Amino acid sequence: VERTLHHFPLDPASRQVRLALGEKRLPFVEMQVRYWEMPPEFTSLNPSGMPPVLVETKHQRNLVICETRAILEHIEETETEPPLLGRDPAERAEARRLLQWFDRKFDNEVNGFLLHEKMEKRLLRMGAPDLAALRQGREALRMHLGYIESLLQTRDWLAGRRMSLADFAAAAHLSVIDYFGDVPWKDFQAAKTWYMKLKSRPCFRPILADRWPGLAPAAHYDDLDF
């Protein structure tokens, strides 16, 4: 199968797909999309206008898989090597719960403040961050970090004994916040240790190489020691 991933580098959803494909050693070509500019041609691929979109081609027939709910389940169903969902129903349920936790709750309570006020406003030339919005995002982030810390002191990985899509979801989201220097790793020891381990995996390497014009990452962003 040929794979083309239409994505935006600093998008957590996109990064989850890049981590899953990398971890499964599935090659893909990438096409970067400035989706906020609503390029007509991308909206013809995905009517929501949002990345990521994975196009799988086999014998010149295309399967256009849009956004993470469809993409991640497709990957896990069709490429078992290695599994990013556990075998026990409880581990599968817990990982999926955590996918939803990050894609909805974390995205709303943290990203809607920290990523909106800094990255999105910059890209749309809408001016400076609202400092109160930033303070609200930072406090929400600390509450989410505390939650994952409590999990990681009781489990090896977020969803239990096996590394899963839940780890990649949390790490994808945190990696973008980390690019903008906003994660207080020093205060959450189990979470710091967990991220350091994820960040050193081969699948993470391209993500650490991400750079976008006008958006200069924190100095430690691509350091394996931080």
From Swiss-Prot:
Signal peptide: none annotated. SUPFAM superfamilies: GST C-terminal domain-like, Thioredoxin-like. GO terms for biological process: cell division. One of its GO terms (cellular component) is cytoplasm. Residues 1-83 form the GST N-terminal domain. Induction: Cell cycle regulated at the transcript and protein levels. mRNA levels peak in predivisional cells. It is found in: Cytoplasm. Residues 88-221 form the GST C-terminal domain. PANTHER family: GLUTATHIONE S-TRANSFERASE GSTA, GLUTATHIONE S-TRANSFERASE-RELATED. Essential cell division protein that must bind to FtsZ for division to occur. Critical coordinator of envelope constriction through its interaction with FtsZ. Promotes the formation of highly curved FtsZ filaments, reduces the GTPase activity of FtsZ and stabilizes FtsZ polymers. May regulate FtsZ function by modulating its superstructure. Does not bind to glutathione. Belongs to the GST superfamily. This is FtsZ-localized protein A. It comes from Caulobacter vibrioides (strain NA1000 / CB15N). The gene is fzlA.
